[PDB]
């Protein structure tokens, strides 16, 4: 950051980085979630694998 | 134009040309609960309407 800047924003205009007010260091912000898994099944009428 | 006159070619030419065509576009996927409420738990219960 430049010495007078405290925030950082991404192309979506949402915050992604901050400055710690006491140590003056930069921190990234990342989501904690992962819902999009894909499940391959051969049909429950045949097996439960 | 006349009524007893005809024109005939005595020679020829070989020609090569091109033609472009689209076939497919980009595939995309979406997850509402991440797009709409990001990582909030309070907004999930309201979106569940
Ligand atoms: C029919 O068309 C072809 C196309 O060019 C003629 O071929 C050219 O004719 C003379 C003969 O050597 C030269 O000016 C060129 O070298 C020939 N073509 C090439 C690619 O070299 C041919 O002469 C024509 N025929 C008549 C009877 O006019
Ligand atoms: C020449 C011939 O035989 N038929 C026709 C004749 O009607 C005329 O000379 C001209 C226009 O009409 O076109 C040709």
UniProtKB/Swiss-Prot annotation, chain A:
It comes from the Viruses. Glycans are attached at residue 45. Attaches the virion to the cell membrane by interacting with host receptor, initiating the infection. The major receptor is host ACE2. When S2/S2' has been cleaved, binding to the receptor triggers direct fusion at the cell membrane. When S2/S2' has not been cleaved, binding to the receptor results in internalization of the virus by endocytosis using host TFRC and GRM2 and leading to fusion of the virion membrane with the host endosomal membrane. Alternatively, may use NRP1/NRP2 and integrin as entry receptors. Binds to host ACE2. RBD also interacts with the N-linked glycan on 'Asn-90' of ACE2. Cleavage of S generates a polybasic C-terminal sequence on S1 that binds to host Neuropilin-1 (NRP1) and Neuropilin-2 (NRP2) receptors. Interacts with host integrin alpha-5/beta-1 (ITGA5:ITGB1) and with ACE2 in complex with integrin alpha-5/beta-1 (ITGA5:ITGB1). May interact via cytoplasmic c-terminus with M protein. May interact (via N-terminus) with host bilirubin and biliverdin, thereby preventing antibody binding to the SARS-CoV-2 spike NTD via an allosteric mechanism. This is Spike protein S1. It comes from Severe acute respiratory syndrome coronavirus 2. The chain holds residues 559 to 607 of 1273 of the full protein.
């Amino acid at each position: 950051f430049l010495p007078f800047q405290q925030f950082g924003r991404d192309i979506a205009d949402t915050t992604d980085a901050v400055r710690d007010p006491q140590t003056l260091e930069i921190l990234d912000i990342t989501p904690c979630s992962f819902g999009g898994v894909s499940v391959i099944t051969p049909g429950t009428n045949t097996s439960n694998q | 134009y006349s009524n007893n006159s005809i024109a005939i070619p005595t020679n020829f030419t070989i020609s090569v040309t091109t033609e472009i065509l689209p076939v497919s576009m980009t595939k995309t996927s979406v997850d509402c609960t991440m797009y709409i409420c990001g990582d909030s738990t309070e907004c999930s219960n309201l979106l569940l309407q």
